[PDB]
Amino acid sequence: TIEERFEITGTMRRLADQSLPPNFSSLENFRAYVDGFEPNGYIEGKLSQMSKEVNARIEPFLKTTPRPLRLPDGPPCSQRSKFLLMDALKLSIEDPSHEGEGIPLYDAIKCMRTFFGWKEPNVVKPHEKGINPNYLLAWKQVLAELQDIENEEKIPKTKNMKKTSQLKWALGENMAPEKVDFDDCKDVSDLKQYDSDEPELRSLASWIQSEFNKACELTDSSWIELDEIGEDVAPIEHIASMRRNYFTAEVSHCRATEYIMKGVYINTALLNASCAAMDDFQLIPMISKCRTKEGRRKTNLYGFIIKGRSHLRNDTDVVNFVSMEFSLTDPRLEPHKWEKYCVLEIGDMLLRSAIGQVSRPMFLYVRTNGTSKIKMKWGMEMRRCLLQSLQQIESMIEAESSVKEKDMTKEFFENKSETWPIGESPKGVEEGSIGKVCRTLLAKSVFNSLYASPQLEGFSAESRKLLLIVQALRDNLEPGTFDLGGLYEAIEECLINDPWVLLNASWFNSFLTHALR
Amino acid sequence: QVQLQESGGGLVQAGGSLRLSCAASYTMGWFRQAPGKEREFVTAIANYADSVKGRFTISRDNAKNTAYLQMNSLKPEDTAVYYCAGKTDYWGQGTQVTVS
Amino acid sequence: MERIKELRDLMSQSRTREILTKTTVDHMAIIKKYTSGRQEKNPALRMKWMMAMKYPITADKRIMEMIPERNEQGQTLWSKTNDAGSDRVMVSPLAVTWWNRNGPTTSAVHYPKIYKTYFEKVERLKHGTFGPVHFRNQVKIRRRVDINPGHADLSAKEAQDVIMEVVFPNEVGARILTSESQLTITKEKKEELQDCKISPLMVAYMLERELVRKTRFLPVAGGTSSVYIEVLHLTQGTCWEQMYTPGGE
Amino acid sequence: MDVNPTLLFLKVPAQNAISTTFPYTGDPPYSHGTGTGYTMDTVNRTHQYSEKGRWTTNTETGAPQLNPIDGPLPEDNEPSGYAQTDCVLEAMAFLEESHPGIFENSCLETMEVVQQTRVDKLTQGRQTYDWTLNRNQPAATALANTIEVFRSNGLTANESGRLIDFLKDVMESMDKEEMEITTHFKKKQRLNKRSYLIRALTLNTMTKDAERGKLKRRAIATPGMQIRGFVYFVETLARSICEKLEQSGLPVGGNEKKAKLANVVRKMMTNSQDTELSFTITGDNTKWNENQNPRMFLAMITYITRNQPEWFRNVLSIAPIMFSNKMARLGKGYMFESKSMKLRTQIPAEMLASIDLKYFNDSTRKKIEKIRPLLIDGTASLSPGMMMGMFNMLSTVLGVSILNLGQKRYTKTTYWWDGLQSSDDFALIVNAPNHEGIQAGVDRFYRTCKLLGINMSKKKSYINRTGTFEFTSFFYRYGFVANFSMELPSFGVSGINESADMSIGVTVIKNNMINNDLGPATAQMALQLFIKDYRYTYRCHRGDTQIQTRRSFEIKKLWEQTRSKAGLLVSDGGPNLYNIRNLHIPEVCLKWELMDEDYQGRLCNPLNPFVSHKEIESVNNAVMMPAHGPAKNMEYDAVATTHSWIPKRNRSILNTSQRGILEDEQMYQKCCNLFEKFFPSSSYRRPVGISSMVEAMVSRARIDARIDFESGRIKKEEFAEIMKICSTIEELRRQ
RNA sequence: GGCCUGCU
RNA sequence: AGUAGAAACAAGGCC
């Protein structure tokens, strides 16, 4: 026989005497009071005595209640993407190799030799904050070293570049302040905290809207070459395969898929180079392989990326690189969209047109950008945007097919009778077929993955709340709110400078205007 | 449970106007049947078929329990029996519209 | 012979001798889990980051005497630099594939006998017969169902003694199993796995998985049988039902 | 025409397309530097929500503590932590009355568990704040260090192997004049009574990363090892209690949560007749943890443990007693930059008490000025309220008491309410004959909540008619609707190993098909994309391609060597045979009949130097931290192949003064491996006893040599050699 | 210039 | 410069 003894004594007892309500002196007395306590209507007394200003009055939510979300005002919003999306240009070879098949440098050189009309590069639009001559010299250095590879025996799989002052400045080398001890730096007046304040305010511009518009447009190529799956054995598997083939036919010829492949390849190459060649600057040509309507496979070279020192320890540590991309879009028409870019004139292009032949200029967008391990990892998983979008569409199809006891995919994709509101024109709201909805959702997911930021998450949550409230209103469910101004202030604090979140807020305002009728 | 009675059909001039109304005992549709064919979609409540868009307007009064079809700038090709329909299945007997 | 010999070698050095002397059996687990390695918060990010390095995986020292240091072209397969807090050495992923093309071979005939659950799943599916897909709204209602289709009507602790007596007959201690169902299970799984040399721990784990009953709460519509729940993803959907009959029936 | 996805909601209801409103395809927000600012802000906010309380100075720790309990009743809708003892005791009494026998039973099972629990249960935990080194370390490491220090100081009751005895030693340590700790730079340092008290009552603060759904970052806390046993016992009691409450939803999963929500909504609306109106409030509680006073949890537990053995009451009361005096470490510190001299500096947080305020901005300057009075030995007293959901289950109990307090038997009015509470979130279905009744009911519910220190977030809450609501990212619209955007981040390679990643990916696809209503074609697309990413991550391509990688040569020779190439695993560059019908089968078993016997034997060879198994717990369990939720573990079906290797470790310990920890790790692992070879059941069932290693090992050597001669390889020569070698190690242990 | 580490 | 956003990266430490 034995009795378990867990005795509170010593210091730990005194602590127990100091963890009681205000008017108790010992744990013994408080436990005695608790044991002797019985309910005698004490909540009612304090409820009656409590001030009546403590209330949760319900404010009715009507059509005239919700006001449009206010957008921040300031300098126009700039471009944040790691590569050109709407203004990209492609140099091609028409080779039979597959996406991963081949060697990067040789393919890039072969694609670039396919173009004739090179001119000595010159400044067109300066960075406005950097040293454009450094960008010019970097471009000429890249060309020279590309030729140097072309001369020798076998094209190396991966090339390292020289660490000249040009790319030392462009890649931000030896600029991190040296780490020292506080006891040695205390009398320095300039010594203070890191700048920690709300980001700069910027107003929305019309370029992001057009970029999204053309990100949902069809193309003359198939930008997805899917892998293999076990041969379908069940009828449900056949239905799934037919649905999947329909969606692939709809979305493969879409600029969103091209952006997905571009981002995946670029981030994969950048991460692998950073993990392998941590010290030495590395050249990586932007490569993407597609298939033409005729069926011939083709390669495309958008430009080059120079990765710098990438001794990345934390998931937030930044690897800086410099990106160069060919384009034909003149930067003199929307300068505010290219605040952080330096754009040169590098050649002239001749594309067959009925107006003689255009002989357009051909510029080089050069900029210094940066990423991190987390950003690289998440940008190399951009293919789940396809999932998100097509899961939404398949949920739509299944929900509609639960009504009519039959699979409804084929008529949705061919007859195109039913349409959903997927945009507004000055005439009014415009509806498109299911395929256009697929492409629109895919583009939305791709832009979410490209312009991701805390602002996007906060706005998404605090605007989903208001969207649910508005949906309840439209469903005739007598919605009510306790503090709608607080919710509005919570939504409006997420809109600071991100083009994507500001465009989403403008879309939400338009949806409110069209809704509530 | 849902009975439907259409009103407002008749003989009309080409380029004329006509207000159909369907009284009932839910979403509503207007459909038409020409003498040589099966059912043709006209409107639902809003959406309008290509052959009738901009010419015709569908509306409803949920307090009167009535759906209306306001037809304008009528063509000889609108000549049909116009049927009202209710869904969660319920079809009216149809009202004759003859345009000439 | 060997075992007591490395025991004596350990006791030769003062630090390990002190660890062996002062540490009691109960603390076994604690010191065994004593490690400086934090549990990873973002495994995917680092797996995608480590695989870009040379020598990203770890293997026992014995690899240095079964696999050559380099392959035909000279790509290194393993390194002699040990891991952070272990005697294992860091090696390249090629040393895996190499082991699958010229490494030692054995008789894997008994793996089907060990991994009974998975092979039973494969056999059940191979002989299944599908049917037409019917499209109609499915009223998925949430219910508690048993997922394991081979549970022998035993709980975790109830079958743990059976598993020990099957694998570790000497560490059973006081317990001698009374239920005769447990007697027959012990006899069968003893004579069946009498010389299997996969590992005692994996054998025990798979016996626990096979015999112990496990239950989970899932949205189901129809079925409700153990064999019909493992394929619940293939037979029931949002607006479609796929008639299926596993090979067992 | 301008494309606008949001307009899609004009035809598709919001909940039927809510997945579009979840941007879970991009990088989630991360914190970059110190979390000291957030810690100070949280401390100040917790202290100013209870400003009208009464101040005292603890005689043991000497820290200022603020007690708001029984303070003035709130006169505004702002958050308030002035909980009333009598009101909460009455709420618990009504909870008991509506559920007779709940507390007595739960206390009985908790007493059983506490008196049969072992010390090793504390090792099954994530990072904990080791006070021996003043830093976060794995639970097992911190427990071992604390046990070593206790044994060195003379507290050896934990040698009984009982968690209750470990807690007895922990409390006895509180009354010691001078303890001793070890530091490496080894130096023995002496800690007086007060310093050790503060080191045992302190919490370590960090910044929470990968938190999706808010613009601002938050701070979280991790307690020490002295207080985790009491927390374990208290949470065991709270879980046993909540398991008996149908209004709670914290100790269950997601599907159970949905089922209970559907049941409660149907019960509330169906029982309501045509005359009664029904309204659902989708409520979130603002500053949930900052307004929950540990003293009130002490009151709740001492009411729960009435008419129970006094030792049980004491052991369950120790935890809130320590939380009421809890201290919080400010954090990593602050980093300064000087651009004129082009340098950077890192000052630890412990200097915030004395460091001048010229380096700090206005906001941080004011935060430091406000928090300085509470700074004691580099840590701030945080008595008023909990820091980060340590008592989740007790908070859920309080919320369930509030929910049950409106069962129409205590309301004494036509209106009534019910619903479901899961800490920091709730759904409240209130019925009343008229809109005035609903308004009165919600007002009284809010008022009663304010009497218990619980606040309702008016900005994140809204009320509509029943039939449509939200609860923890679950949107109910006449039936729960799948989202699939919460599980999107889990569709990639998990990062465990090749076989584990393959099995986890296929199993995740299967589960999201079963639960989150993932479509067949979408599932096939997910399988294809996952296979592509898997091959591109592990450098294991189909083998018939010309994609040159660091692993494409060996894979290609294995491909050309194999005859039946359809049996090769995707990890070895083989075709993928997976499909919707094969998502529940491991890859090895699906390709078993197609593999060549040579490759099959080479693959699944027990003697492979790659496979390593430590314990029964870590055989086929993978810890995947889900997005928008706490860390979770999953059982994944996999066959132990040569691909089941474990990845490289950090290896950065070599540059730190804590370098001897690796030598101790190696020696401990060598001893553990020797013991396992001596005691094969060491892993599956953790050995128990009070003897020492060498005794068991030598004695079992004796016996096993004996019997393995009585039949086996041993010989008299070898048996006698072993016997006298055992004697040799015996005399060695003597000296 | 030479060598060490990349969640400690 | 750049990334990024309530604090950081733009390699660290050891000789």
Numbering used by the authors:
A (entry chain A): 200 to 716
B (entry chain F): 1 to 25, 32 to 51, 58 to 100, 111 to 122
C (entry chain C): 1 to 249
D (entry chain B): 1 to 185, 207 to 756
Article excerpt on this structure:
Central to the replication cycle of influenza viruses is the viral RNA-dependent RNA polymerase which transcribes and replicates the viral RNA genome. The influenza virus RNA-dependent RNA polymerase is a heterotrimeric multifunctional machine composed of polymerase basic 1 (PB1), polymerase basic 2 (PB2) and polymerase acidic (PA) subunits, that catalyzes both primer-independent replication (vRNA to complementary RNA (cRNA) and cRNA to vRNA synthesis) and primer-dependent transcription (vRNA to mRNA synthesis) in the nucleus of infected cells. PB1 houses the polymerase active site, whereas PB2 and PA contain, respectively, cap-binding and endonuclease domains required for transcription initiation by cap-snatching. High-resolution structures of the complete viral polymerase from a number of human, avian and bat influenza A viruses, as well as influenza B, C, and D viruses have been determined. These structures have revealed that the polymerase is a highly flexible macromolecule that can assume a variety of distinct conformations, enabling the polymerase to perform both transcription and replication that require different initiation and termination mechanisms.
Using cryo-EM we determined the structure of 17 polymerase-nanobody complexes at resolutions between 4.5 and 6.7 Å; this is sufficient resolution to accurately position each nanobody bound to the polymerase heterotrimer. Three nanobodies (Nb8189, Nb8190, Nb8201) bind at an interface formed by PA residues 615–630 and PB1 residues 10–15 (site 4b). Interestingly, we observe different potencies for nanobodies that bind at similar locations, for example Nb8189 and Nb8190 which bind the same site on the C-terminal domain of PA; this is likely due to differences in the affinities of each nanobody for a given site. In addition to the core of the polymerase which was resolved in all structures, the PA endonuclease was resolved in the majority of structures (excluding Nb8189, Nb8190, Nb8192, Nb8196, Nb8202), while the C-terminal domains of PB2 remained unresolved in all structures. Nb8190, Nb8191, Nb8192, and Nb8207 caused a significant reduction in viral titre at most time points tested. Nb8190, Nb8191, Nb8192 and Nb8207 were shown to significantly inhibit viral mRNA synthesis. The site bound by Nb8190 corresponds to a site against which the 627 domain of PB2 is packed in the transcriptase conformation, potentially preventing the polymerase from assuming the transcriptase conformation. Accordingly, Nb8190 inhibited transcription although it had no effect on the binding of the polymerase to Pol II CTD.
